[PDB]
Amino acid sequence: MGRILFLTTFMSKGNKVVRYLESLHHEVVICQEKVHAQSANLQEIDWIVSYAYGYILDKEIVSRFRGRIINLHPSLLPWNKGRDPVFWSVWDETPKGVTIHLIDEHVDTGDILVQEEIAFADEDTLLDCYNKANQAIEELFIREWENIVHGRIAPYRQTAGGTLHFKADRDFYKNLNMTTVRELLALKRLCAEPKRGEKPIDKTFHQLFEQQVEMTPDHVAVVDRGQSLTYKQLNERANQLAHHLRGKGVKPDDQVAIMLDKSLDMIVSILAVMKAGGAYVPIDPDYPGERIAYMLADSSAAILLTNALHEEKANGACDIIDVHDPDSYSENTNNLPHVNRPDDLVYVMYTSTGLAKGVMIEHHNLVNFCEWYRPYFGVTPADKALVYSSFSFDGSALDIFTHLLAGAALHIVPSERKYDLDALNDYCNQEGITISYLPTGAAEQFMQMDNQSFRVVITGGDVLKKIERNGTYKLYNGYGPTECTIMVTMFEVDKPYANIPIGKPIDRTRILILDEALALQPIGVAGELFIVGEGLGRGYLNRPELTAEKFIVHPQTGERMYRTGDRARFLPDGNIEFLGRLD
């Protein structure tokens, strides 16, 4: 009756479509390559029927066969034009269906001939959906072919709108072919881009702190032994030192070294550097003199805040400001004119397998963590927290910065009870300490101590393993590198686990579990843990090449991501599970 040209690249040679047409006594020429006008495949052809044909017909051919080029596209056009339609129908959660339509001079925009809705089960695999879709459209073609031949169908233009996808848009999702609709949509909710509406963080830390001072000015801010400062007292003293700092030339993104033991002078010095404009570089004086000399060298710090006691450990490296010389403090107690942006440096902390690298953290990094910490743990001015961790580690940033913006009171931990945790337990029961973060090592020990003051304890760092504790406080396990600011995930330990999970992401952060090719892994599959979002800092100071290696631009998405080097996987309940290092 007529010679039909069947164009396809993915479909086999014996589809129900081809065999049905042959049963109607049509010679079906099958071709799986791009063709031109001269092609012997176009000689004495009556109808062209395309079905998953991965090439574009020349405009010369579309005109000669106008009204005689039929296409089988397993989507509900205009939804999911282009490649991998069924997959994007599930992922983008569009209306699902199959369409037989005419061919325009563009991609799958020609007028429709016939169309019908299809349904995918929540348990079908995307391969199952691919097969159910192709079967449905093939049966439809067989049903409606006679109406198409005799030209009795009235073609209607496609609804406005839709979506379009190209061949490479699925590269990032290449490992998801055998996942279930359920499993796939869950992966979307966990790893999909942020929804519209969000705005950039617009506050620095000392902005939010100066705010908290005006709301609880007479509340206790920090306590060391018998002495204490209020928020107003702390703020005014920090201002007095900040004025002197900015006078000696401190400016945004400038580094200012602080070498002090835990004390009131430390909190004053930290806030003073911030309020002055710069970022503080903490140096624990108990470090070997070699690391100290190196930290001052790598850091561009021209100024060092320190005692007369530790003054000499610097060997005249920088202009020293004695925190005990009344000349280092101005008369002015007012808050300084703001000159900082959320993307300015707030602090620089080092980590060391090789040399120590200066991790740069910006205000917006710190602000995000604190603003998540307050409501997550329900912190209120009624609370009291320990300043336990060394102020050269990011754990101190948790102790100091989070609780200061909640209006709580900080309690300095001196040397005598840093390691003696039974004596520390007594201090907590006396002063009524309510919340604090202890590294995994020290947290496991405190479980043996009989405690009644704590309401929350947070741990992280090494692998948590012990859980049984005497007190009646909630235990929280968290995880995160100093490169992405303190922590990025948090778990409330409720029951014992052989492998305690590290929890779900905090505000404005996502965690992606990728393969070696940086492609998504289905939920439950192990892979390298990548961090994305507000937590990511600026990178390593004076290590641009190393920064590029660890702070990557993703090949497909193009989002900035941090390569942790850690092995993990998502559990069915959304909590992340640590699975050791990669090497």
Swiss-Prot record:
Linear gramicidin is a pentadecapeptide antibiotic produced during sporulation. It comes from Brevibacillus parabrevis. Residues 3-145 are annotated as: GART. Belongs to the ATP-dependent AMP-binding enzyme family. Large multienzyme complex composed of 4 subunits; LgrA, LgrB, LgrC and LgrD. Activates valine (or leucine, but much less frequently), and then glycine and catalyzes the formation of the peptide bond in the first step of peptide synthesis. This enzyme may also play a role in N-formylation of the first amino acid residue in the synthesized dipeptide. Two module-bearing peptide synthase with a C-terminal epimerization domain, which is probably inactive. Each module incorporates one amino acid into the peptide product and can be further subdivided into domains responsible for substrate adenylation, thiolation, condensation (not for the initiation module), and epimerization (optional). At the N-terminus, contains a N-formyltransferase domain that is probably responsible for the formylation of the first incorporated amino acid. The lineage of its organism: Bacteria, Bacillati, Bacillota, Bacilli, Bacillales. This is Linear gramicidin synthase subunit A.
